Symmetry: D2
Subunit: 267 residues, 4 copies
């Protein structure tokens, strides 16, 4: 109820699936939260859902705009007098096909922009008000695409989630000297939010297939489980971990099962 | 106070520095704990320190003896009716010099025995009473020597802490199908327990030097911080993570600073 | 003399230190080479140095311009009738200070542009003329900053050399199905080319300090040694390796020596 | 024909599939080779196949016996006056079932013995005659099981191929200071030698299934391709690489394809 008693957090991408569950869970633990996002009304329905303006508020922030990240942070210092936690949770997918041949050049630029520079800007301004307090935890959401590939996950998303781990490792080596921890969380498929762009995509259905394909049975990965991993990294109880890419895939990425399924027996 | 309400845990190596702080912290969180060890009287002073026989008890167990691991587990099922958590925390150092030339062949065998087979045996018997309950978390203590080297850490200790990550990754791929999570924790120097074998070794003093050499300043790594990492992995809040080697080094292993210190400027 | 007999290669960044030694070594092995670069006259003195126009030629190509990468590749197909090898060896450093606080936003964009999109564009057009031949090796130069950090290596260079490994792993998973291998080479400090921007930087002198700080003694890392690693990956003898980040650091990144040097003995 | 002109090599496990192709290829490159093995007559038919006693000879050596590794090395110094290359290529599989529950305790001990201590002993005696020459390359065969898991690859084989990478990384950090490089090679399924223990196992047939399951199409992984990777590491052209686990899996381990195949489209 108060494990994060004290704390002031900013959730970048906080109107979304992992961002709202995380904010909900940081409020349940005693913190003051600022959800930041470009999705206006969804960001407002999320906040005014969870608690009152005294604990959560919404700020518009387009994290590829430095004037907006400057404003998001300076508005959190003016509201709550400090910054303990920054969770940089913005990420977008590609909107061109997977093959390198049909993968767009503009699309590459823009996914690189939202996903990596957007994370650089967030760490830049959080490090501005955390270095003088000589305390802080910056948590980035990377992905299991921060170290593996997948047929169907575009080459710019893999390249961008590797560069997010790249800033995690790099910021960690600069900032641990000011007592600031930098970590990232690498989830597998997080369950929803009821999906159609193509057809197939429906989101009782993507977790059903994520279970087919899962190492680890009997549990569904939901946003609540990533939330618990960044609540650990964010506060409470993780004050000597800064190395970390905290993979939350139930062990999916520890094996490639293609030659074992080609193994089998009984015919 | 009750985050681990329910739980039945076995701490292998539980009379030692990381093992006692962990057991202390699992009792503070509502669990029933069995400390297992070859250090008789220290294991008894640790238990009878923490709480009453109703929550913690001591069992003698030499984890390179399968009859003793069989007995440690069957005695936990007979006392508490189940097994939720197994923390395999036994590890020993080498007692021959570092150079491959002076590194002992008997010593190699025996460190391999305590550190790897001892961990295989613990997972073997815990998996015996966890697979029918189709629930469980096995946590191993590995080390940052599970993926790096160090001048002065013997070649059998590096090779054994890599093989502990090897069983972590391997058991994870077998057991996630019975809903059992397998993880390991990789700490940097954990502070004590007031050390002399050589001279130099004194243990207000090893953390002082671990801070010299540390990425991350202003905090000392103590057994309480590894304890918090295995309490996360053990229960509460980590039920879709099974991939993990949870490094707790404040970012030490993310850089080699030798060519940056050879960089400098001011002469 | 003819180990690469047949071969047609493009060296992106080929007027530079690793690019010219590599081209020199692919010509010594029987290949036809196209050096591509924005450094006009240096690219021309490199080519007209090595051999005649029948084996090496220079093309101007600014690898952040797709019309120029389109032209570099189509000019190699028109000259030599095919494309066997693409070595994407362009990389730039940061020109703002290391601290996240003083690290430039424009500089981030531009280093991201040259180093990652520039590599995406090279793989995009090489994959255009390699997929119909269903043969090919794409080699990228990443860095040991593709998986570690360093005080003094800017946060955009770490983030960009992680994203180059990201495209290596991702392109490998797409293109191995057309028989195309994708690899990268991760060198430590490569010796020169006689350096001043600041003072200190002089390049008999940087390898002297790279030896101070080196795992592995008695050898200096020079461009000839990276050249040998990409000649292996490029042809000859590596036709079932596609996973690879081929680290060429003499073991530098396998240890952090800060707590061992804080260890020592004799006082 | 003479790329390895000079060289004196020991192939541990050299009567086997990867060991004989490697020895064949080191003789074709100008070296003097000593195949070492417990398979007597097969080791003799391999040697007396390849060339005369002046270049290859067979020594019996059970690499879990230090008196035999002492003898194998001292017999190579007495025959050829030096030691340039040590390739520790012994490995055995498990002979108990995969499940941790049915995995044998004696079998664990013995696979640990052949695979890890056997590699420790080889590096121990090679480092004896290489440190005074202050030159040398020790190459170990690890496996892709040195960093991943597989259903059906026993928990002691994963744990042993991780500990072989553990000694590779550890020996590298000790021995690079005497100018000695330590590397390992991690192959996927190497094609044969015409297999029955169970039925299914036949070895035109295992490469057929290794291709089903392969990243990288159109090539079969054969012992000749691992041979080329250890010839690179062993001599010629790799004299600043010592970090390395040289994966030769055509990219198999860079992806887990289970959720992409659960993705698909057309129904
Ligand atoms: N959901 C998964 O299965 C999955 C897996 C692994 C990693 N991730 C990452 O997890 C993070 C959160 O994703 P999610 O919650 O699943 O998706 P989501 O529901 O799309 O939430 C992400 C939020 O980012 C917001 N956003 C986009 N651009 C900007 C911008 N430029 N400025 C400010 N806000 C912006 C967007 O409005 C959205 O609410 C992202 O980094 C993902 O890439 C997702
Ligand atoms: N302390 C550090 O700085 C450090 C760093 C990284 C990893 N580790 C690992 O952390 C684990 C715990 O170590 P610690 O608490 O620092 O040391 P410790 O105080 O030596 O505790 C380990 C316990 O293992 C016990 N033990 C030894 N052999 C057996 C056996 N065969 N059967 C049963 N019990 C046995 C021993 O009595 C001791 O109490 C070990 O695996 C270490 O290798 C330690
Ligand atoms: N040299 C080292 O110590 C070191 C270490 C690790 C990795 N690397 C990487 O190795 C690669 C080669 O670097 P190097 O040979 O040392 O440096 P270099 O001498 O600067 O050569 C790189 C070449 O890239 C060229 N270039 C820059 N921008 C463009 C552009 N947009 N279009 C076309 N050409 C361009 C540039 O003219 C130069 O000749 C780069 O990716 C480095 O980042 C270098
Ligand atoms: N073949 C594959 O698909 C595969 C994949 C990945 C790694 N590996 C490893 O590659 C290495 C070579 O295996 P391979 O050539 O396929 O198999 P192999 O044909 O069994 O050859 C290995 C040799 O080791 C020999 N040997 C066994 N015990 C001893 C001993 N105690 N002392 C001396 N010699 C002994 C044995 O006689 C055999 O000839 C081993 O380390 C494997 O574990 C194999
Ligand atoms: C099992 O691995 C992953 C796969 C998925 C499924 C997709 C959503 O996010 C991804 O990266 C996946 C596939 C995808 C589809 C379309 C794209 O536009 C895209 O590229 C950016 C990616 C999710 C998390 C995992 O981590
Ligand atoms: C910074 O890295 C580490 C170094 C240390 C210091 C030593 C204790 O445990 C080790 O492995 C270290 C060195 C050492 C000394 C003597 C030995 O007998 C031994 O070999 C087994 C190891 C601790 C944790 C770290 O993870
Ligand atoms: C030991 O590690 C490395 C360090 C170096 C030395 C520098 C040149 O390239 C780098 O990345 C290093 C430091 C540096 C200085 C100034 C910068 O502008 C820069 O940022 C982009 C980097 C080279 C290769 C290594 O791999
Ligand atoms: C795709 O991955 C691998 C799988 C294989 C197939 C088997 C032979 O070696 C292995 O480790 C695999 C499976 C296996 C079967 C029986 C066992 O006794 C054993 O355990 C030791 C292992 C080979 C190389 C790969 O690297």
């Amino acid at each position: 109820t108060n494990r994060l008693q004290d704390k002031v957090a900013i959730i970048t991408g906080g109107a979304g699936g992992i961002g709202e569950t995380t904010a909900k869970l940081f409020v349940r633990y005693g913190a003051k939260v600022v959800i930041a996002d470009i999705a206006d009304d969804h960001g407002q329905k999320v906040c005014n859902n969870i608690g009152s303006p005294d604990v959560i508020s919404f700020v518009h922030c387009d994290v590829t705009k430095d004037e907006d990240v400057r404003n998001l942070v300076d508005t959190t210092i003016a509201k709550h007098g400090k910054l303990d936690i920054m969770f940089g949770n913005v990420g977008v997918l590609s909107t061109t096909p997977y093959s390198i041949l049909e993968a767009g050049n503009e699309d590459f630029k823009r996914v690189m922009d939202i996903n990596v520079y957007g994370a650089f800007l967030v760490a830049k301004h959080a490090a501005r008000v955390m270095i003088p307090a000589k305390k802080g935890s910056i948590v980035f959401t990377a992905s299991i695409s921060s170290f593996t590939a997948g047929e169907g996950v575009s080459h710019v998303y893999t390249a961008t989630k590797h560069a997010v781990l790249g800033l995690t490792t790099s910021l960690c080596t600069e900032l641990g000297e000011y007592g600031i921890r930098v970590n990232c969380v690498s989830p597998y498929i997080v369950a929803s939010p009821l999906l159609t762009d193509v057809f197939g995509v429906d989101s009782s259905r993507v977790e059903e297939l994520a279970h087919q394909a899962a190492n680890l049975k009997g549990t569904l990965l939901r946003a609540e489980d990533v939330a618990d991993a960044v609540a650990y990294l964010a506060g409470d109880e993780s004050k000597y971990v800064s190395g970390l890419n905290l993979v939350i895939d139930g062990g999916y990425t520890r094996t490639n099962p293609a030659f074992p399924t080609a193994l089998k027996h009984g015919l």
